Structure formats: structure tokens, C-alpha cells
Amino acid sequence: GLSDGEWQQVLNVWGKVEADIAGHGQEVLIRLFTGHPETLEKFDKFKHLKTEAEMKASEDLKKHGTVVLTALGGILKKKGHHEAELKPLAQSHATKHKIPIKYLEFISDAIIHVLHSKHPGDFGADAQGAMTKALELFRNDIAAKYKELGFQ
Ligand code: HEM
């Protein structure tokens, strides 16, 4: 798990995301979709987006970005004690959305990328290290639920 100091850094970094949840959310999704087009196909409601320009102009994509980061934020504020918040997401993504664990790796990397892009020089080594551990914990706990379901 993460140390108390690491959790503090994670939640301090998250303060940046909360200042503009819609903006960070949009950029994370766009980064995910542009870098890994196979992910866009998992969204029937976003498959119509053929260009990044259309993605950037999609108010529904911004809307979903807000739903996604709000969920993650709630989970992060639990500092590891997130079984109740995490189990339902793990099961909805495996059974309903059919999202390979690899895609969660993609979005984790996208979050780190977006943080550096929006806060260059203000996302230090210790901060990236802590946020990375938090995302891996998130990812690993979802992976455990995936194995339970036998989903690949
Ligand atoms: C930071 C990790 C993620 C979080 C916190 C997250 C969160 C959410 C939330 C809260 C919902 C709506 C409720 C639900 O259906 O469970 C949702 C829906 C969905 N998510 Fe994720 N998600 C994550 C990663 C992914 C990834 C990597 C994909 C891959 C493409 C994905 C695909 C979907 C799809 C297809 C839907 C349904 C959208 C709709 O039709 O309205 N999610 N997600």
C-alpha cells in the first residue's frame, strides 16, 4: 500500500484535478481515445467521434469525463479502504462494458500524462511516484475482481 506521506501527496495532487474536473476529465479521455483507438470502440456513445476536434467539442465527453474523475476521486479519498466503492466499478467494467485490464493501464498512463501537460514543473518526482502507486493500487484491486469473474 501507500504510506501516509504518499497518500497526502496523492490527495494534494488531486486538488489540481478538482479545480477543473471537467477539463482534466476531457483531456484524460481524449488522450486515451487518441492514443488507443480500440478504447473508443467500447463506447457506443463516443464512436461517432472521428476527429479530436469533434472530441474536444463534445459536451457529452466532457460530461462523462466529470463522471469518471469524480468516481476515481472518491475512491482515492478512501486511501485504500475502497472495497465498497471499487467492487461495483470493477464488475460493471468487466461484465457490462467488457474493458480489458490493459485499458485501465492506458487510462492510468493518460492521467499521469495529463497532469504533466496541465501542470508542467508542478508535478514533481515524489508526486508522480505517489499518484502512480495510487493508480496501480486501484488497477491491481480491480484486477483481483476481474480474476474472480474470469474476465480477460
Ligand atoms: C480511472 C478508471 C475508470 C473509472 C473511475 C471509470 C468510471 C466510470 C463510471 C463511474 C462509469 C458509469 C457507471 C458505470 O457504468 O459503472 C463508467 C462507465 C463506462 N466506462 Fe469507465 N471508468 C474507468 C475506466 C474505463 C476504461 C479504461 C474504459 C475503456 C474504454 C471504460 C469504459 C466505460 C464504458 C464503455 C462505460 C459506459 C458509458 C456509457 O455508455 O454511458 N472505463 N466508467
From Swiss-Prot:
Domain Globin residue range list: 1-147
List of residues binding nitrite: 64
Modified residues (Phosphoserine): 3
InterPro entries attached to this UniProt entry: Globin, Globin-like_sf, Myoglobin
Subcellular location: Cytoplasm, Sarcoplasm
Gene3D superfamilies: 6.10.140.2100, 6.10.140.2110
Alphabetically ordered keywords of this record: Cytoplasm, Heme, Iron, Metal-binding, Muscle protein, Oxidoreductase, Oxygen transport, Phosphoprotein, Transport
Principal cellular location given in the protein's record: cytoplasm
Record bears the keyword Lipid metabolism: no
Gene Ontology MF terms in the entry: heme binding; metal ion binding; nitrite reductase activity; oxygen binding; oxygen carrier activity; peroxidase activity
Reaction(s) catalysed by this chain's protein: Fe(III)-heme b-[protein] + nitric oxide + H2O = Fe(II)-heme b-[protein] + nitrite + 2 H(+); H2O2 + AH2 = A + 2 H2O
GO BP annotation list: oxygen transport; removal of superoxide radicals
Signal sequence region: none
Enzyme class: oxidoreductase
Known function: Monomeric heme protein which primary function is to store oxygen and facilitate its diffusion within muscle tissues. Reversibly binds oxygen through a pentacoordinated heme iron and enables its timely and efficient release as needed during periods of heightened demand. Depending on the oxidative conditions of tissues and cells, and in addition to its ability to bind oxygen, it also has a nitrite reductase activity whereby it regulates the production of bioactive nitric oxide.
Name of protein: Myoglobin
